[PDB]
Amino acid sequence: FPKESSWPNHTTTGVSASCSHNGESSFYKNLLWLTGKNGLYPNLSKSYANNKEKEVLVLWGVHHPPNIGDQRALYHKENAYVSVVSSHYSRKFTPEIAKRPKVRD
Amino acid sequence: PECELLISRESWSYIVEKPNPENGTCYPGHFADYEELREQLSSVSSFERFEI
Numbered sequence: 001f002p003k004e005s006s007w008p009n010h011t012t013t014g015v016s017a018s019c020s021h022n023g024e025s026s027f028y029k030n031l032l033w034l035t036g037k038n039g040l041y042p043n044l045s046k047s048y049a050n051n052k053e054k055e056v057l058v059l060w061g062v063h064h065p066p067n068i069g070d071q072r073a074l075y076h077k078e079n080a081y082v083s084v085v086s087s088h089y090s091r092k093f094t095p096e097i098a099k100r101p102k103v104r105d
Numbered sequence: 106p107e108c109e110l111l112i113s114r115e116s117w118s119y120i121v122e123k124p125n126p127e128n129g130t131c132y133p134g135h136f137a138d139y140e141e142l143r144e145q146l147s148s149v150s151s152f153e154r155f156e157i
């Protein structure tokens with residue numbers, strides 16, 4: 001995709017303390033910690049077709065906040081599913097957890 | 106439906122598959138533990154097709 005011509009309804013300025021570069025907060029370079037936009041989070045159905053080039057590899061992740069408060073105040077609604085689908089890969093993720101220990105602050 | 110013309114025998118020593126056969130699962134999907142089933146069904150000494 002493009003960075004700013006494919007997600008116009010989802011802020012992508014993903015900040016995190018643990019992923020600091022030189023004392024300033026940041027995130028990964030190959031991924032994008034979407035956090036909604038304008039106090040909402042529209043249901044996205046973005047796709048891609050590997051008809052061009054060769055056997056490409058695709059990377060993604062799901063974030064499990066450490067409490068219901070982060071879910072409610074960040075994605076603005078609980079019970080959020082992630083369902084990647086392809087010809088031979090159609091499993092779903094339903095991350096809903098309310099506690100964790102502390103690792104790497 | 107395309108594979109119902111099989112030779113309905115009773116016992117076999119090893120099954121045979123065409124390399125990448127065309128008419129496999131007519132409905133598209135994922136066969137869970139397919140490889141385990143294939144390894145188990147490789148040999149059978151008595152194969153009585155019942156209906157539960």
Ligand SMILES: *[C@@H]1O[C@H](CO)[C@@H](O)[C@H](O)[C@H]1NC(C)=O
Binds near residue numbers: 008009
């Ligand atoms: C993003 O929001 C606008 C309205 O604000 C809407 O027209 C557009 O369809 C949305 N994006 C997608 C991919 O649906």
